[PDB]
Design an enzyme around this catalytic site. Structure first.
Site, PDB file in Angstrom:
ATOM      1  N   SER D 142     -13.658  -3.638  -2.338  1.00  0.00           N
ATOM      2  CA  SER D 142     -13.341  -2.796  -3.488  1.00  0.00           C
ATOM      3  C   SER D 142     -14.475  -3.003  -4.481  1.00  0.00           C
ATOM      4  O   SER D 142     -15.205  -4.002  -4.390  1.00  0.00           O
ATOM      5  CB  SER D 142     -12.056  -3.272  -4.185  1.00  0.00           C
ATOM      6  OG  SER D 142     -11.752  -2.555  -5.373  1.00  0.00           O
ATOM      7  N   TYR D 155      -5.811  -9.647  -6.955  1.00  0.00           N
ATOM      8  CA  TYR D 155      -6.525  -8.629  -6.183  1.00  0.00           C
ATOM      9  C   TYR D 155      -8.022  -8.832  -6.331  1.00  0.00           C
ATOM     10  O   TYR D 155      -8.769  -8.820  -5.358  1.00  0.00           O
ATOM     11  CB  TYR D 155      -6.108  -7.248  -6.700  1.00  0.00           C
ATOM     12  CG  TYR D 155      -6.643  -6.064  -5.912  1.00  0.00           C
ATOM     13  CD1 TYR D 155      -7.831  -5.435  -6.299  1.00  0.00           C
ATOM     14  CD2 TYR D 155      -5.923  -5.536  -4.820  1.00  0.00           C
ATOM     15  CE1 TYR D 155      -8.331  -4.323  -5.598  1.00  0.00           C
ATOM     16  CE2 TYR D 155      -6.392  -4.417  -4.128  1.00  0.00           C
ATOM     17  CZ  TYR D 155      -7.589  -3.817  -4.507  1.00  0.00           C
ATOM     18  OH  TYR D 155      -8.057  -2.714  -3.811  1.00  0.00           O
TER      19      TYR D 155
HETATM   20  N1  LIG Z   1      -6.933   3.239  -3.137  1.00  0.00           N
HETATM   21  C1  LIG Z   1      -8.007   2.717  -3.734  1.00  0.00           C
HETATM   22  O1  LIG Z   1      -8.489   3.226  -4.939  1.00  0.00           O
HETATM   23  C2  LIG Z   1      -8.780   1.566  -3.184  1.00  0.00           C
HETATM   24  C3  LIG Z   1     -10.080   1.336  -3.661  1.00  0.00           C
HETATM   25  C4  LIG Z   1     -10.854   0.312  -3.120  1.00  0.00           C
HETATM   26  C5  LIG Z   1     -10.340  -0.464  -2.088  1.00  0.00           C
HETATM   27  N2  LIG Z   1      -9.057  -0.244  -1.672  1.00  0.00           N
HETATM   28  C6  LIG Z   1      -8.558  -1.058  -0.558  1.00  0.00           C
HETATM   29  O2  LIG Z   1      -8.366  -0.165   0.561  1.00  0.00           O
HETATM   30  C7  LIG Z   1      -7.400  -0.767   1.430  1.00  0.00           C
HETATM   31  C8  LIG Z   1      -6.348   0.292   1.808  1.00  0.00           C
HETATM   32  O3  LIG Z   1      -5.865   0.857   0.614  1.00  0.00           O
HETATM   33  P1  LIG Z   1      -5.091   2.241   0.436  1.00  0.00           P
HETATM   34  O4  LIG Z   1      -5.324   2.670  -0.960  1.00  0.00           O
HETATM   35  O5  LIG Z   1      -5.425   3.075   1.632  1.00  0.00           O
HETATM   36  O6  LIG Z   1      -3.552   1.765   0.414  1.00  0.00           O
HETATM   37  P2  LIG Z   1      -2.270   2.425   1.165  1.00  0.00           P
HETATM   38  O7  LIG Z   1      -1.141   1.725   0.528  1.00  0.00           O
HETATM   39  O8  LIG Z   1      -2.190   3.896   0.969  1.00  0.00           O
HETATM   40  O9  LIG Z   1      -2.475   1.931   2.652  1.00  0.00           O
HETATM   41  C9  LIG Z   1      -2.260   0.548   2.916  1.00  0.00           C
HETATM   42  C10 LIG Z   1      -2.178   0.355   4.429  1.00  0.00           C
HETATM   43  O10 LIG Z   1      -1.994  -1.022   4.720  1.00  0.00           O
HETATM   44  C11 LIG Z   1      -0.742  -1.165   5.414  1.00  0.00           C
HETATM   45  N3  LIG Z   1      -0.100  -2.460   5.191  1.00  0.00           N
HETATM   46  C12 LIG Z   1       0.468  -2.936   4.011  1.00  0.00           C
HETATM   47  N4  LIG Z   1       0.939  -4.184   4.267  1.00  0.00           N
HETATM   48  C13 LIG Z   1       0.672  -4.514   5.549  1.00  0.00           C
HETATM   49  C14 LIG Z   1       0.964  -5.625   6.332  1.00  0.00           C
HETATM   50  N5  LIG Z   1       1.667  -6.691   5.862  1.00  0.00           N
HETATM   51  N6  LIG Z   1       0.549  -5.620   7.650  1.00  0.00           N
HETATM   52  C15 LIG Z   1      -0.106  -4.558   8.238  1.00  0.00           C
HETATM   53  N7  LIG Z   1      -0.365  -3.440   7.460  1.00  0.00           N
HETATM   54  C16 LIG Z   1       0.031  -3.416   6.150  1.00  0.00           C
HETATM   55  C17 LIG Z   1       0.110  -0.017   4.955  1.00  0.00           C
HETATM   56  O11 LIG Z   1       1.246   0.243   5.786  1.00  0.00           O
HETATM   57  C18 LIG Z   1      -0.957   1.088   4.989  1.00  0.00           C
HETATM   58  O12 LIG Z   1      -1.255   1.491   6.326  1.00  0.00           O
HETATM   59  C19 LIG Z   1      -6.841  -2.008   0.700  1.00  0.00           C
HETATM   60  O13 LIG Z   1      -7.438  -3.226   1.171  1.00  0.00           O
HETATM   61  C20 LIG Z   1      -7.193  -1.715  -0.745  1.00  0.00           C
HETATM   62  O14 LIG Z   1      -7.182  -2.912  -1.520  1.00  0.00           O
HETATM   63  C21 LIG Z   1      -8.288   0.771  -2.176  1.00  0.00           C
END
Ligand SMILES: NC(=O)c1ccc[n+]([C@@H]2O[C@H](COP(=O)([O-])OP(=O)(O)OC[C@H]3O[C@@H](n4cnc5c(N)ncnc54)[C@H](O)[C@@H]3O)[C@@H](O)[C@H]2O)c1
Ligand SMILES: NC(=O)c1ccc[n+]([C@@H]2O[C@H](COP(=O)([O-])OP(=O)(O)OC[C@H]3O[C@@H](n4cnc5c(N)ncnc54)[C@H](O)[C@@H]3O)[C@@H](O)[C@H]2O)c1
Ligand SMILES: NC(=O)c1ccc[n+]([C@@H]2O[C@H](COP(=O)([O-])OP(=O)(O)OC[C@H]3O[C@@H](n4cnc5c(N)ncnc54)[C@H](O)[C@@H]3O)[C@@H](O)[C@H]2O)c1
Ligand SMILES: NC(=O)c1ccc[n+]([C@@H]2O[C@H](COP(=O)([O-])OP(=O)(O)OC[C@H]3O[C@@H](n4cnc5c(N)ncnc54)[C@H](O)[C@@H]3O)[C@@H](O)[C@H]2O)c1
Ligand SMILES: [Mg+2]
Ligand SMILES: [Mg+2]
Lengths: 260, 260, 260, 260
Positions: D142, D155
């Site tokens: 991130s 985080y």
């Molecule tokens: N959305 C953003 O602005 C953003 C920005 C930078 C980085 N990120 C990172 O991107 C990654 C994904 O984020 P996202 O926004 O797509 O979130 P999301 O919530 O939409 O997707 C999260 C995914 O992880 C899965 N998950 C959650 N807990 C789990 C567990 N215990 N075991 C296996 N799978 C699990 C969920 O079911 C889902 O498939 C994360 O590491 C997040 O920190 C997100």
């Protein structure tokens, strides 16, 4: 000076933490020592610092691998010393292995002490510091909070986490009279490092000092070890009013390690 | 303390540089002031520092836009003061514009003073420091040596360049008793910043202090200006023996600017 | 694919620039080449490139040490090729010496090409890109735009400056369909590096390959050179729609150099 | 193209992970999907990708908060798919609170998934990739792996830890046919971000899109969300041969977030 202030230094029974506790005591701060080792030697250190500097010095043997014991260390410092101005989160451990050979127990232990103890100690300190309108949180990270070495995955991850956590601490406290910064030392010749010197001398079949010089040359352009006294001076500076707007940053004390 | 040491501070007739010179004077260093201004006003500053701190204070008005003048300032320092222990490369200018509107003349001026003067001053100083086995080079970069803002391309480029140059100075001098570091301030309410406050006040049609607060709020979490006194204390720390293994690094004094 | 887009690659008659110009051609982009060398070989390259990829490939020998020549190269690319979509600022030179031995002429020349040409190139390209509502500025910085080595003061400074300037370029263009980013290569076996390998061979009394591996080993953990082909692929990525929100950042292609 | 390769993408049932899995499938890679949500929707996704791109697609519902489950995911991927070429460590969670209010259970849960699962997954994958002489480990960190925000201590710590861990991974595998890199996105409008948009909307009394715009403008200069499709493209690029010497680095896809 720091007369009338209270500093808690985790892992201050030896090495870097003892150098920091000593420097803070020399500025007139009351001190809470913490850490393991020989109890008679610890009492001598504690009584000696109190006598030498004319400040109150307490020892709290909390095992900082347990979150509640870390929070208890801070809350009991306030109970006994009356306030907490300076929290130095210094206690840490090391273990080296390839990632695929890295025992989960060792990964967990390094995250618990080197990263989570910073969280728990900070969480306990902040309500006091906010009520005081004064605090200094000084986290002892590492050159390894900014860059990596092979075979140190848990330690590098933890130290990077401490750097990030320090930044969040600063942002949440910004303008409230509280700063949070991370000191990032290069090599300091404590037992944590001596163990790795010994290992390298074995691996290479050279004497201890030849291994020491090689260990330095690989990482530290100055070819000079950082000292606990230097790091104490750096903590003293961050605790000073000149550093009132130094917050959320790293101060590298590393003989040029991260410059290249 | 810095008794028996000589510090040159470029652009020390006002603002940050004067704060740094004053702090070093207070630790007992002889001082070379530099910069522009009214003869009577500068002489009052110079004579007042000397008398107050019981140190020798020279003023050399060399225009540091010319490489030969910078080296001549260092030369004159050694000639008149006997030695040079500390070089603070501080003089700098600002100009704001979109890149496609940026006058080449202003690009050139900002690089020559903000970056090249550091090269020339360092080049003149190093042979003295190397022979002495002691030196401190303290470059005043900016938060803009590490991150950017819109409309400040020459300044951000030069300040980034100062950060890189500092690192090389450190690696070239490692272990020789010489360190080189860059202090990176956030907002300090000098005329360099007042001009931008004024510009914002007119653009947004509000008073000066509302414009002041917004300039701060945009970049600096603490919502407090950094002071010349604090930067002076930071310089004094970098000049001290505790900082003997702090080299090739940045010290951000920015109220949390770069943490987010 | 980059069909119907126009790319200017500075310093593309050889080494890295040629690799980038090629990769972009192979994606269907019209090219303006630039650089020095035998004009017969330059026609051979230019013709060979145009024929193989089915693209209009122009040449322009403009000496980029001069601001107006850089601004000319861009404007003349627009007049001749109809538009400018991708500006790759790649032309650069190197010179090694201790700071106190570094000739002012070399310092000035390294800044003029390695840094100021980026400003002049960008300043010219921006008005077009903005009116177009699309553009990609790709600056070829270096690992030395992020860290330093001894004896490369002007190079390290200019390259840090490019990284800074790249950030400002991004901020000023944000949301306007234009991105700016800096590719930061580790060692690429070009003449610029062969020169240094040759020097090390002589210094150590070893063959060219022992010198090469040791050069690599010092800086580059993978122990493998980066290639113009790879840098070309990196440029292609930055130019793609996937990289639409990649702006104001560095992409290190360095085999681990900056990781430790 | 990635025909013949196997990619494991953690948390690829939704959001960024689904975008990355989709992008990799489109390049011919066989895929192991993972994560939670609606089982009927997950099957539609799995069967859909398989049929659309003519690749094998497996779903493994392992709960990656348990280290043994993460290692089981990798080991069973090798069992069922024949090999593992690409490991995308993507699954993550968020919780916002001041440090002194941050529940220990939420601190622990964030470190376990957002950091420790990256270790466990990497540890299981490495022996296979080292055997094969090819590997790509792509960690979804991130902007918060490089800078901080208030109220996101766990985080930001975890994400900084992932950046450090990625570097160690790169150093341990340098030259062996394996790269490890961390993609660092700015805002992507997934449910993880929507929950925050909603809280902002209620805090400020504005509608959802006013809140979305403000959340954007606070952090992200382009004022555009990054997309899972863009991140898929970035992953595809890092999996490519052009990125063979991109290792131990961060790739910021953040619309200028970390530039300022
Ligand atoms: N959305 C953003 O602005 C953003 C920005 C930078 C980085 N990120 C990172 O991107 C990654 C994904 O984020 P996202 O926004 O797509 O979130 P999301 O919530 O939409 O997707 C999260 C995914 O992880 C899965 N998950 C959650 N807990 C789990 C567990 N215990 N075991 C296996 N799978 C699990 C969920 O079911 C889902 O498939 C994360 O590491 C997040 O920190 C997100
Ligand atoms: N020595 C170095 O080169 C170096 C460099 C950079 C950073 N650091 C960091 O400096 C800090 C101190 O390291 P050091 O080199 O002085 O090591 P050290 O082993 O000499 O001291 C460690 C201290 O922590 C204490 N401690 C260990 N586990 C504890 C626990 N569970 N609860 C309470 N106390 C505990 C020890 O008793 C001792 O007081 C560590 O965080 C280390 O990671 C060390
Ligand atoms: N004020 C800030 O918020 C701020 C923040 C970060 C960094 N800085 C940096 O701090 C340094 C000092 O800035 P300041 O705000 O005090 O500026 P200032 O304008 O108040 O003072 C600048 C000083 O430099 C001198 N000077 C100008 N041109 C010169 C030249 N050609 N030769 C010799 N001296 C010259 C002036 O006489 C004056 O003494 C600069 O390098 C600036 O970029 C300032
Ligand atoms: N080779 C490496 O290991 C390495 C590593 C990182 C970054 N870089 C950077 O990559 C870029 C290209 O380097 P390279 O190794 O391909 O160098 P090179 O010597 O092989 O190529 C230099 C190119 O620039 C041209 N050039 C030189 N001066 C010029 C001028 N005044 N006007 C127009 N063109 C001019 C030359 O004609 C040639 O085409 C440089 O910016 C360099 O700093 C190189
Ligand atoms: Mg390094
Ligand atoms: Mg920022």
């Amino acid at each position: 000076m720091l007369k009338g202030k209270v500093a808690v230094v985790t892992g201050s029974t030896s090495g870097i933490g003892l150098g920091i506790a000593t420097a803070l005591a020399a500025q007139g701060a009351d001190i809470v020592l913490n850490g393991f080792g020989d109890a008679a030697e610890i009492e001598k250190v504690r009584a000696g610092l109190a006598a030498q500097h004319g400040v109150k010095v307490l020892y709290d043997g909390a095992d900082l691998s347990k979150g509640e014991a870390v929070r208890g260390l801070v809350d009991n410092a306030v109970r006994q010393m009356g306030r907490i101005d300076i929290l130095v989160n210094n206690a840490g451990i090391q273990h080296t292995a390839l990632i695929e050979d890295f025992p989960t127990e060792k990964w967990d232990a390094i995250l618990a002490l080197n990263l989570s103890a910073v969280f728990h100690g900070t969480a306990a300190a902040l309500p006091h510091m906010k009520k005081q309108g004064f605090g200094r949180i000084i986290n002892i990270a590492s050159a390894h909070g900014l860059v990596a070495s092979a075979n140190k995955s848990a330690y590098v991850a933890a130290k990077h986490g401490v750097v990030g956590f320090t930044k969040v601490t600063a942002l949440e406290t910004a303008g409230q009279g509280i700063t949070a910064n991370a000191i990032c030392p290069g090599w300091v010749r404590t037992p944590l490092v001596e163990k790795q010197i010994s290992a390298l001398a074995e691996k290479n079949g050279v004497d201890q000092e030849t291994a020491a010089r090689e260990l330095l040359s690989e990482k530290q352009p100055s070819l000079q070890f950082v000292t606990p006294e230097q790091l104490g001076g750096t903590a003293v500076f961050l605790a000073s009013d000149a550093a009132a707007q130094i917050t959320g940053t790293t101060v590298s004390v590393d003989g040029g390690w991260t410059a290249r």
